[PDB]
């Protein structure tokens, strides 16, 4: 029921154990040195 303003899709591949690190306030190898989400992140994280 919504319209989205500035839609960006960020795609990558990680380990199964590192999927938990894709979150606004996570630490770890991926969250620190590879890909960090903002604290006020608005959007959806999808992993398969």
């Amino acid at each position: 029921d919504l319209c989205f303003t500035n839609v960006y899709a960020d795609s990558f591949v990680i380990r199964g154990d590192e999927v938990r690190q894709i979150a606004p306030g996570q630490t770890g190898k991926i969250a620190d040195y590879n890909y960090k989400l903002p604290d006020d992140f608005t959007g959806c994280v999808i992993a398969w």
Binding site: D17, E18, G25, Q26, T27, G28, K29, D32
Partner: protein, 49 residues
């Protein structure tokens, strides 16, 4: 000594080890240690450093 231990204890006889006088630089675990679960309760993870 903790995450690379050869043998772990049983859950009913879980082992407790004191940690003192050391620098908690957990980034050294990035190379070899992969964790399925990492949940902190009384502190945000990004503040641990």
């Amino acid at each position: 000594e903790v995450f690379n231990a050869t043998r772990f204890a049983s859950v009913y006889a879980w082992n407790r080890k004191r940690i003192s006088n050391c620098v908690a630089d957990y980034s050294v675990l990035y190379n070899s240690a992969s964790f399925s679960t990492f949940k902190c309760y009384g502190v945000s993870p990004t503040k641990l450093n």
